[PDB]
Amino acid sequence: VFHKIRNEDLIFNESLGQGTFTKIFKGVRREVGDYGQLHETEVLLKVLDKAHRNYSESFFEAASMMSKLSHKHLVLNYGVCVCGDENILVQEFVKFGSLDTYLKKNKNCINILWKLEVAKQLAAAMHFLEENTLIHGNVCAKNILLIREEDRKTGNPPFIKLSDPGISITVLPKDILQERIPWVPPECIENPKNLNLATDKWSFGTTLWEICSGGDKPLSALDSQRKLQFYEDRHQLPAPKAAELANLINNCMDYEPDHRPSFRAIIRDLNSL
Ligand SMILES: NC(=O)c1cnc(N[C@@H]2CCCC[C@@H]2N)nc1Nc1cccc(-n2nccn2)c1
């Protein structure tokens, strides 16, 4: 499915951090573009750890999911580099990075309208996936990328894209899934094979909580055992201090998966504010 990119056409530059069994770099791809123009394009290079090569299928299936459909709110995958012993996903480089970092850095100048616009865009991307019956499986603020900053001077809203989910929770070790509470929904802690469209509605709620909490991580003070007991006791997240979306967050984070609202209903709710 994926376009194969030669290792020789890729330059690896600085490490940007780590994902689950991955290391992430900024790089450059040399390519021929439209009209035969030569380009040296900034790219995100996502590299599967050699020690976890056994996850390669799920590693690439994540990307393949995103590239099944084309949409203005979904990250572009340029291709893969599987030369030699490396498993590399090549993705569009998104200048302003992921939303959790951006929210933490830019608290003082992010207001409720900015959060509402971003929430609406994420809901639009999820409605598109839901209409296509395509599960994402790892909606969270780290996987939302800021393409364009809000410019109140020209009325331009911010613009985000949803990035790929990474290796699926259906294959990850149990301890990692538990560390990912409360993004991973309770039914998936009970049985990771319970991954379903309803999964994304729960994680969407958790992500809205991040958006409203300046990039804080919900339940970060709880170790894994306490996160588990949080689900066992059927707790909900505290309302963010900016609590405008708190009812929507809790409605999405419904312990009954069948009761979680459709993304059309979610969008209708967002539009009402
Ligand atoms: N498609 C992308 O461009 C992209 C995708 N994912 C991520 N995730 C980042 C890196 C890996 C760990 C998690 C962290 N949120 N960052 C991206 N771009 C980016 C752009 C500017 C700066 C940085 N940056 N500088 C220091 C750290 N991150 C990253």
Side-chain angles (χ1 to χ4, degrees), residues 21-36 38:
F21 303 152
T22 62
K23 289 176 175 36
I24 292 162
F25 302 81
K26 186 172 175 171
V28 175
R29 173 190 180 195
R30 302 191 193 90
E31 59 184 321
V32 179
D34 294 338
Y35 311 104
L38 290 169

Side-chain angles (χ1 to χ4, degrees), residues 115-124 204 208 244-245 248 263-273:
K115 295 168 166 62
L116 191 61
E117 178 64 30
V118 166
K120 286 181 180 166
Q121 294 182 27
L122 177 64
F204 176 84
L208 285 194
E244 287 80 9
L245 295 180
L248 181 58
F263 277 101
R264 183 180 340 261
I266 289 170
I267 288 170
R268 286 209 213 88
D269 242 341
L270 287 168
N271 288 337
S272 78
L273 321 167

Side-chain angles (χ1 to χ4, degrees), residues 16-18 24 44 92-98 100-101 145:
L16 303 173
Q18 303 177 335
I24 292 162
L44 190 85
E92 75 177 291
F93 184 71
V94 177
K95 176 175 188 165
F96 300 97
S98 59
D100 61 326
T101 305
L145 305 179

Side-chain angles (χ1 to χ4, degrees), residues 84-85 87-103 105-107 109-141 143-151:
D85 62 341
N87 287 114
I88 299 157
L89 178 60
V90 187
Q91 295 180 316
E92 75 177 291
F93 184 71
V94 177
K95 176 175 188 165
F96 300 97
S98 59
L99 211 58
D100 61 326
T101 305
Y102 189 89
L103 289 157
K105 173 180 177 293
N106 299 292
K107 279 188 195 182
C109 36
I110 289 184
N111 71 5
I112 178 57
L113 296 179
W114 190 105
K115 295 168 166 62
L116 191 61
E117 178 64 30
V118 166
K120 286 181 180 166
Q121 294 182 27
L122 177 64
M126 303 307 302
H127 175 70
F128 178 80
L129 292 174
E130 179 172 32
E131 292 277 85
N132 283 278
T133 67
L134 189 46
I135 296 157
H136 183 271
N138 190 15
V139 178
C140 57
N143 283 338
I144 299 168
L145 305 179
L146 189 68
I147 289 269
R148 179 185 71 198
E149 298 195 290
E150 168 182 83
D151 179 15

Side-chain angles (χ1 to χ4, degrees), residues 8-36 38-49 51-52 54-56 58-60 62-67 69-85 87-103 105-107 109-141 143-151 154-173 175-189 191-192 194-224 226-235:
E8 38 270 36
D9 291 326
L10 297 176
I11 305 305
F12 277 81
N13 295 314
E14 60 262 43
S15 165
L16 303 173
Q18 303 177 335
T20 297
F21 303 152
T22 62
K23 289 176 175 36
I24 292 162
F25 302 81
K26 186 172 175 171
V28 175
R29 173 190 180 195
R30 302 191 193 90
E31 59 184 321
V32 179
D34 294 338
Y35 311 104
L38 290 169
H39 290 81
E40 292 200 11
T41 306
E42 295 189 325
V43 296
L44 190 85
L45 298 170
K46 284 195 188 165
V47 188
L48 181 61
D49 288 340
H52 301 291
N54 58 296
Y55 288 99
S56 53
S58 184
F59 173 76
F60 286 123
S64 69
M65 171 251 154
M66 297 299 291
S67 289
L69 316 168
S70 178
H71 190 275
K72 63 183 183 184
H73 285 308
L74 300 178
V75 64
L76 291 181
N77 293 328
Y78 294 138
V80 302
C81 177
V82 293
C83 300
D85 62 341
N87 287 114
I88 299 157
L89 178 60
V90 187
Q91 295 180 316
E92 75 177 291
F93 184 71
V94 177
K95 176 175 188 165
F96 300 97
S98 59
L99 211 58
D100 61 326
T101 305
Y102 189 89
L103 289 157
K105 173 180 177 293
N106 299 292
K107 279 188 195 182
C109 36
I110 289 184
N111 71 5
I112 178 57
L113 296 179
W114 190 105
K115 295 168 166 62
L116 191 61
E117 178 64 30
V118 166
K120 286 181 180 166
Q121 294 182 27
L122 177 64
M126 303 307 302
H127 175 70
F128 178 80
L129 292 174
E130 179 172 32
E131 292 277 85
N132 283 278
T133 67
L134 189 46
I135 296 157
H136 183 271
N138 190 15
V139 178
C140 57
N143 283 338
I144 299 168
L145 305 179
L146 189 68
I147 289 269
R148 179 185 71 198
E149 298 195 290
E150 168 182 83
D151 179 15
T154 66
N156 266 27
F159 192 95
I160 53 89
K161 283 185 178 188
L162 174 66
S163 185
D164 71 282
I167 296 161
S168 179
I169 56 168
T170 65
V171 300
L172 286 177
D175 51 288
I176 297 176
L177 261 64
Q178 292 183 3
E179 292 174 353
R180 289 185 181 189
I181 296 176
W183 292 270
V184 171
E187 69 272 13
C188 286
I189 300 296
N191 186 341
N194 279 336
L195 183 64
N196 190 266
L197 284 177
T199 300
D200 287 333
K201 289 158 176 86
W202 173 287
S203 308
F204 176 84
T206 312
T207 303
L208 285 194
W209 192 100
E210 294 180 275
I211 286 165
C212 295
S213 305
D216 287 355
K217 297 308 178 291
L219 305 187
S220 66
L222 297 191
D223 68 354
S224 285
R226 285 173 174 82
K227 296 182 208 296
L228 265 178
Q229 190 62 33
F230 178 97
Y231 278 176
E232 290 285 345
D233 290 327
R234 299 287 197 102
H235 289 310

